[PDB]
Design a protein around this nucleic acid. Structure first.
Ligand SMILES: [K+]
Ligand SMILES: [Mg+2]
Ligand SMILES: [Mg+2]
Ligand code: NA
Ligand code: NA
Ligand code: NA
Ligand code: NA
Ligand code: NA
Ligand code: NA
Ligand code: NA
Ligand code: NA
Ligand code: NA
Ligand code: NA
Ligand SMILES: [Zn+2]
Ligand SMILES: [Zn+2]
Lengths: 88, 47, 30, 25, 134, 204, 88, 84
RNA sequence: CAGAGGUGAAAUUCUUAGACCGCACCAAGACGAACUACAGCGAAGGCAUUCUUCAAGGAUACCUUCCUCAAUCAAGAACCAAAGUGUGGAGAUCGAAGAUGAUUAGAAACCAUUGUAGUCCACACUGCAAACGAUGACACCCAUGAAUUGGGGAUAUCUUCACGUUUUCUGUUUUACGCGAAAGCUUUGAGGUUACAGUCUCAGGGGGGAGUACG
């Protein structure tokens, strides 16, 4: 059965910190405890080991990036520009 | 502290202090060019 | 054993690639 | 008067009624 | 002045800015980085309303010729303009009077061009979406 | 008082006067092409040529080509309600190292026996015409010096090549180069500047 | 798309093999007709296969797709990196 | 009571949904482009009295070379067109 | 170098260390004039600089394949101008609130100078418009003359593809019987209805209270 209506992983806090701060922290907590895609090995295998360290147990590899997510939106621009300049 | 004391909790004097104040007197907003909530664009901060 | 095997194969293949590239450069030069 | 102005008056009265009901409850 | 014979013509550029509020008669060189005389219609009339009138712009032209002949310039290239931009493109009332008074005063008119600014695509202009409710 | 000298591509030099050497250089002087080339074709009267000062010799200012543009009255006149207007922007680098941007405008015309109200073109043919114009301009202007490039544009010999070579694609009422601007210059060379002007006129 | 259709036809009526070890075995036995490798492959791992193909004079095709893409083209629910066709 | 079968604009039953508005020439009011009255005007810079004086004093303009004109497109709101 | 601005007229402003004006340049943010129209595209809301790129959509051509697979809908779902809300950017122009001039018996307004939120972007909400053709979707018949957009078939001109004539399919507009209280509609109906039956679906029952109260 379903155990909470809307308060998900944040249900461990009880009634204790304010609805909006809990709702704001929930998205980052979910993304930080999720599992992310590995471009090499082609599967969902990346897990966080500290505030910016992501580790893939399949390929046995560690990557630097993002506090609560594997890739930040700012890095996509850098990779696109680098690839285009290399193509030139 | 320069701000301590009183029967109510308050600062008796302006909290903007000079750039030439001696150590011990330089507490508060130091050499502030402006105070209050900014309306409009936010400028850059620094010399 | 797997690390030793990987190192052996990598050594051989890299040396072959280097030899081919250098020979191609010299043949273009001459 | 203008129906838009009358609707504004109705909205203001309804908002006041909701606030009064919340305070009185 | 310049080292030329009496017959030889020395050429300048006159910028004529005719809005509804006022009129400008500005004389420069070909580059535009050096100016000789600048007389406006508001320097010859004691009322704000008469600043742009064709009469007021007429006097601004004559006093330009008096000083210009002293500087050693006898011919002018015309560059007329209006407000432009996001505003009206129609020139003001004093544009005709300013140019005509230059010709009768004894200035050799060269080539005439229209240089009012025009936007390829512009910004929003004054007034609401209801316009000016006069 | 100083004198402004145009390069050797134009016949009537010494076209302006002005009223300390560091401040003088860099000024831009504008003149009408009909005055320099001294021709009565009634078509070069609508072209303005700009020159920039690079070196002052005595009281003579030695200039170099800056830009060229058609007057607003002529450009406004060639617009018709039931036609198609096409524009093209081309950037080409010459042999010397000058890179220039060109703007080209073309208009459609109806056929001799056409009985339709309008003469709109098709987007496929407009794109094909645009592709041809940039290809030939990039080819001819990239193998000549700055002196030859100005002569081609001012003498109106490059424009006649497009109208002849692109009329089969679409019937054209008129095709003109609206504006030419120099957007990049190489390093300054004293020897190159003197060669362009040849024998300078004397000034008093 | 042509290569995907051809591989589908081969799988419907032919004999193929998945896996680096089995592909190398087919190359050693001289029972291989074509080898297909995906793009996301480690350099040394792909280099051994390419070296064997060159030595045996066997044609080699580069898929330019993920290993998950190659598995989907093969019509499977698992990722495959190397494919060896023994009978067409 | 419908006054015009085109409702004062050149937009039929259903072929468009929205047309970019433009500012009136005089008051600056925003009106749809197909509803605004639009005229293109070409006018002489100077009138006959002033043109004769300038042409006589100009070594460039004369019988053969004509004087330049001003070409503009003017779009007005329906009110500004009636008053003008 | 002695004013510029603003107005019916002025005052609101700004300017001798100097505005307004003229020339070239630099920075940032919006926006792509004219051509632009009883034109084109989209289910609607909506959509105009060029080049490269990704997945789509309609019409046309066909002696290709399949064989009733369809029309319209409670419940349910998705999208939806502007204003507005939250969190991060950006801040050129314009500009609710406000401030200072005008006007007026009076001006809180209309006019002038400014000016914050807004306006622009990404993500997440809101779910309303004279959201109008004030006209639900699908199918059949129907008179005349215009045009015009896209494709196809047959048989007078120009340059080294465009155009002319006649048919044709799809769109998109202008100008008879019949109908209507009238205004008016009219191959794309508001026609074919007391001579009343092609199919489905959403609303209405004199005017206010009122789209209000309670849930
Ligand atoms: K609408
Ligand atoms: Mg004053
Ligand atoms: Mg303002
Ligand atoms: Na103290
Ligand atoms: Na306190
Ligand atoms: Na306090
Ligand atoms: Na005035
Ligand atoms: Na004034
Ligand atoms: Na349906
Ligand atoms: Na908005
Ligand atoms: Na106002
Ligand atoms: Na926005
Ligand atoms: Na509604
Ligand atoms: Zn991996
Ligand atoms: Zn108006």
């Amino acid at each position: 059965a379903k155990r909470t209506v809307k308060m998900g992983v944040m249900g461990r806090y009880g009634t204790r910190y304010g609805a909006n701060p809990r709702k704001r922290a929930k998205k980052l907590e979910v993304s930080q405890h999720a599992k992310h895609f590995c471009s090499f090995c082609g599967k969902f295998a990346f897990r966080r080991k500290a505030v910016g360290i992501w580790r893939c147990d399949g390929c046995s590899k560690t990557v630097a990036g993002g506090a609560y997510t594997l890739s930040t939106p700012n890095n996509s621009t850098v990779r696109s520009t680098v690839r285009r300049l290399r193509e030139l | 502290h320069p701000h301590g004391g009183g029967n109510h909790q308050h600062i008796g004097h302006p909290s903007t202090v000079s750039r030439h104040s001696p150590p011990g007197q330089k507490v508060g907003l130091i050499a502030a060019r402006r105070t209050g909530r900014i309306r409009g664009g936010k400028a850059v901060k620094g010399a | 054993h797997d690390q030793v095997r990987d190192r052996v194969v990598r050594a051989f293949l890299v040396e072959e690639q280097r030899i081919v590239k250098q020979a191609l450069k010299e043949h273009s030069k001459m | 008067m203008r129906p838009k102005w009358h609707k504004k008056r109705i909205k203001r009265l309804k908002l006041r009624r909701r606030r009064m009901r919340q305070r009185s409850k | 002045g310049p080292n030329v014979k009496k017959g030889d013509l020395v050429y300048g550029v006159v910028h004529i800015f005719a809005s509804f509020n006022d009129t400008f008669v500005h004389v420069t060189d070909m580059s535009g980085r050096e100016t000789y005389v600048k007389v406006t219609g508001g320097m010859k009339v004691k009322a704000d309303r008469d600043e742009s009138s064709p009469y007021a712009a007429m006097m601004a032209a004559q006093d330009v010729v008096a000083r210009c002949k002293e500087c050693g310039i006898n011919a002018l290239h015309v560059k007329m303009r209006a407000v432009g931009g996001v505003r009206t493109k129609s020139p003001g009332p004093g544009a005709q009077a300013a140019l005509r008074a230059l010709a009768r005063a004894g200035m050799k008119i060269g080539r005439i061009e229209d240089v009012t600014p025009i936007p390829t695509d512009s910004t929003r202009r004054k007034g609401s979406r209801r316009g000016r409710r006069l | 008082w100083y004198d402004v000298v145009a390069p050797a591509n134009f016949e009537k030099r010494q076209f302006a006067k002005t009223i300390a050497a560091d401040v003088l250089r860099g000024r831009v002087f504008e003149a009408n092409l009909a005055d320099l080339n001294q021709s009565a074709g009634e078509e070069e009267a609508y072209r303005k040529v700009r020159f920039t000062v690079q070196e002052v010799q005595g009281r003579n200012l030695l200039t170099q080509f800056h830009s060229m543009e058609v007057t607003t009255d002529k450009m406004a006149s060639l617009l018709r309600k039931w036609c198609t207007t096409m524009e093209t922007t081309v950037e080409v680098k010459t042999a010397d190292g000058y890179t220039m941007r060109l703007f080209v405008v073309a208009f459609t015309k109806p056929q001799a026996n056409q009985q339709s109200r309008n003469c709109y073109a098709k987007q496929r043919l407009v794109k094909w015409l645009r592709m041809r114009i940039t290809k030939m301009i990039k080819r001819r202007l990239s193998k000549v010096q700055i002196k030859e490039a100005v002569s081609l544009l001012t003498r109106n010999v490059l424009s006649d090549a497009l109208v002849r070579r692109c009329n089969p694609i679409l019937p054209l009422r008129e095709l003109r180069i609206r504006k030419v601007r120099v957007v990049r210059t190489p390093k300054f060379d004293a020897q190159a500047l003197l060669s362009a002007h040849g024998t300078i006129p004397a000034s008093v | 798309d042509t290569i995907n259709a051809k591989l589908q036809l081969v799988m419907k009526s032919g004999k193929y093999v998945l896996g680096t070890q089995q592909a190398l075995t087919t190359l050693r036995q001289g029972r291989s007709k074509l080898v297909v490798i995906a793009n996301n492959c480690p350099p040394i791992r792909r280099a051994e296969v390419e070296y064997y193909c060159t030595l045996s004079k066997t044609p080699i095709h580069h898929y330019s797709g993920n290993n998950l893409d190659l598995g989907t083209a093969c019509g499977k629910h698992f990722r495959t990196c190397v494919l060896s066709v023994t009978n067409v | 009571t419908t006054k015009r079968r085109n409702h004062g604009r050149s937009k039929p039953a259903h072929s468009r949904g929205r047309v970019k508005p433009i500012h009136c020439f005089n008051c600056g009011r925003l009106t749809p482009k197909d509803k605004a009255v639009g005229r293109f005007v070409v006018r002489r810079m100077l009138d006959a009295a002033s043109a004769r004086d300038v042409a006589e004093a100009s070594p460039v303009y004369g019988a053969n070379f004509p004087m330049p004109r001003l070409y503009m497109k003017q779009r007005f709101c329906i009110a500004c067109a009636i008053h003008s």
